[PDB]
Amino acid sequence: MNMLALTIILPLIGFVLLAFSRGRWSENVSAIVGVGSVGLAALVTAFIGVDFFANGEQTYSQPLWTWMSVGDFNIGFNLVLDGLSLTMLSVVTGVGFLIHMYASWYMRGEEGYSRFFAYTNLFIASMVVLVLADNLLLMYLGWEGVGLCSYLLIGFYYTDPKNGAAAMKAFVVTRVGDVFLAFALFILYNELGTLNFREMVELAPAHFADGNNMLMWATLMLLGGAVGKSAQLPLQTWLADAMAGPTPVSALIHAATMVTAGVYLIARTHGLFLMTPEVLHLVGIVGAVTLLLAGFAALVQTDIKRVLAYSTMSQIGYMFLALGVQAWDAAIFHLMTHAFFKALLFLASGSVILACHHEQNIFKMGGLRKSIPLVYLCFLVGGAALSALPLVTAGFFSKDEILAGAMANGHINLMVAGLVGAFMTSLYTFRMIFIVFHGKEQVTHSLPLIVLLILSTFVGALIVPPLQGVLPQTTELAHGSMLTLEITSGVVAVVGILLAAWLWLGKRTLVTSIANSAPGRLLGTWWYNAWGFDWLYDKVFVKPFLGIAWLLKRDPLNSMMNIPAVLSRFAGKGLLLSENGYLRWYVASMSIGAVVVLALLMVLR
């Protein structure tokens, strides 16, 4: 348990070694250093979990040094480990290790192998810092490190400028989220005098007994930071473009590290949200709206990576819905299970891309179960877990827990939105699966695929996160109520899969009739561009920024301050006309000056 800092130090050492190697080492040595750093972090995490369960799930605090100390402003470089922290650390280290082995197989023969593994090691270290921090500023260090590593890894193929544009857009949108998070940090320090999570929770109800306005502002800004990192409303526009990077980058961003940071932030600061119930309801509403919009967007995508990105947005919306209905255990459970099956789906999609030429439209391929069957099976159980196939997948149990928590607290509208989103999830998932894999044809990586294959089944649901004593328990439904809830969710998922089979497996006559219809074409164009949010942000933020830059590029203030120089030049040129060289004019000017001096003396006498 005293090796808690090793989970940061080993990925940091891996990043430093692989960065300063600069591609000089061989592929095997670079793979050994990177994958072994993440694997040693995972092994230390396993030992930490065994020690954590040895002393009865007691919270362990390991301070290292004091980061900042200016009077009452005291920020510590301290790590903490509770059940939520252990769950996030285990998910991050284990899933990142599996993705690292798959990337060691996958990135063979590519330029920047060691640079890729240095960046992923820094990503792992940043996320471990994020989830292990005991105060908000150290968690902000992990937050920005995760955002920077995401920017470095999305634009990994730097020669294509559109990869760099996608990475820049992801960094800028997430930095807007980080600015909202910074606002939350400023408000919380100004009110409570501390940024330690436990200390803020203790000191909040005494300080905010008179007024609660600043606490509502702080929780609203915390939600803004969370939706920045988790790609929710209204900062969700970067994920589908962040698909520009390599496949293990997408697996790391969507399963292990990046999009789960907002869910972890809301769950960690759950007490402050519990004292602001309207903001928590807003968290749930944002999750519901985001999952509905993401499902509708994923319904009409023509790319596997875009479908998986909007599916990730929908599942993070499910976790935000669980947080907003005060089903915290369900949110973390769905976080872990979604990490499993989304990592499996993204690695399977990368194997598909490697096997079938370059990246392609989904309608170009077809009948791919015969050629590449093991990755078809991986896609099958990944989509079954994504669509919450009952009694055989962990995603079914996670979504059932979320919906039961929504129903038990009286959030009927959020539960209805979750059921509709589950129907659409089955629809888009098996639409993509049946289009890509059905139709007419036109050991370093097998082991992570097998492990994520097993963890996407009910074996993943057998793992229970130890959130006793960290998060409050959700209210239990009546046995009949959760029974019919389970039957309704399973029936909705099975009906959605059957409708996807009826719509896309055979000759898509009704689907093509709907798509070519004018309202259908309009709705498909609207949902394909993710409801026009990218267009709105380009018109509202990007275009006036570029316009003001073009208007200011000549430095108008510099010219305004250069005005006295041109005035001096003009006045000197005008005064030099008096020096015409004529003696009679010099005499006349002397007499003019005599007249002026005499008149001035007589006026002011």
Partner 1 sequence: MLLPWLILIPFIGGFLCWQTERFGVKVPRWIALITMGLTLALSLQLWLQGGYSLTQSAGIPQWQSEFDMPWIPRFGISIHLAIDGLSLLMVVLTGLLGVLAVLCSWKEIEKYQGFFHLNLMWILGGVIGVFLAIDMFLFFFFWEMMLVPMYFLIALWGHKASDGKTRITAATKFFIYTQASGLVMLIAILALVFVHYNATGVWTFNYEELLNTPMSSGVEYLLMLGFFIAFAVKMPVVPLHGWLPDAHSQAPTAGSVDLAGILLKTAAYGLLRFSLPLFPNASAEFAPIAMWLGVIGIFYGAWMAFAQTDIKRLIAYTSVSHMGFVLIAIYTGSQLAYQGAVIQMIAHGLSAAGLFILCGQLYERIHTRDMRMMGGLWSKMKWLPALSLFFAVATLGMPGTGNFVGEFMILFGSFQVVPVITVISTFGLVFASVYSLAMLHRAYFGKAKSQIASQELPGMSLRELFMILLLVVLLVLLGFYPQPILDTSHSAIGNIQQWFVNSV
Which residues from 510-569 bind partner 1, rule CB under 8 A? 545, 548-550, 552-553, 555, 557-558, 560-562
CA distance 247 to 538: 27
Selected range binding partner 1 among 42-50, 163-171, 371-379, 500-508, rule: CB under 8 A: 163-171
16 binds, among partner 1, ligand 3PE, none (CB under 5 to 8 A by kind): ligand 3PE
Question: Quick one: angle between helices 479-504 and 412-437, nearest 10?
Answer: 30
Question: Quick one: angle between helices 518-528 and 277-299, nearest 10?
Answer: 120
Nearest to 80 by CA among 474, 472, 470, 473: 470
Q: Which is nearer to ligand 3PE, 15 or 341 (CB)?
A: 15
CA distance 442 to 366: 7
8 binds, among partner 1, ligand 3PE, none (CB under 5 to 8 A by kind): ligand 3PE
Selected range binding ligand 3PE among 169-177, 201-209, 466-474, 480-488, rule: CB under 6 A: 169-177
Burial zone of 503 (CB within 10 Å; 0-12 exposed, 13-18 middle, 19+ buried): middle
Least distance CB 140 / ligand 3PE (angstroms): 10
Least distance CB 245 / ligand 3PE (angstroms): 14
Selected range binding ligand 3PE among 164-172, 183-191, 270-278, 452-460, rule: CB under 6 A: 164-172
Q: What is the pairing mode between strands 73-81 and 60-70?
A: antiparallel
Site string (54-93) toward ligand 3PE, x via CB under 6 A: ----------xxx---------------------------
CA distance 131 to 142: 8
**29 phi/psi in degrees, rounded to 5:** -70, -40
Asked if 85 and 131 touch (Cβ cutoff 8 Å), the reply is yes
Site string (500-539) toward ligand 3PE, x via CB under 6 A: -------------------------------------x--
The yes or no reply on residue 564 touching ligand 3PE (CB under 6 A) is: yes
Q: Which is nearer to ligand 3PE, 228 or 395 (CB)?
A: 228
Chain centre to alpha carbon of residue 595? 83
The yes or no reply on residue 9 touching ligand 3PE (CB under 6 A) is: yes
Nearest to 267 by CA among 95, 465, 60: 465
Strands (E), 508-570: none
Residue nearest to ligand 3PE (CB): 145
Q: Which is nearer to partner 1, 155 or 317 (CB)?
A: 155
Coil, strand or helix: which one is 98?
helix
64 binds, among ligand 3PE, partner 1, none (CB under 5 to 8 A by kind): ligand 3PE
CA distance 199 to 135: 9
The yes or no reply on residue 213 touching partner 1 (CB under 8 A) is: no
**362 phi/psi in degrees, rounded to 5:** -70, -30
Least distance CB 593 / partner 1 (angstroms): 30
Least distance CB 249 / ligand 3PE (angstroms): 15
Task: Report how far apart, in Å, the C-alpha atoms of 284 and of each of 84, 145, 186, 219, 321 are.
Answer: 20, 27, 25, 13, 4
Selected range binding partner 1 among 187-195, 275-283, 285-293, 587-595, rule: CB under 8 A: 187-195
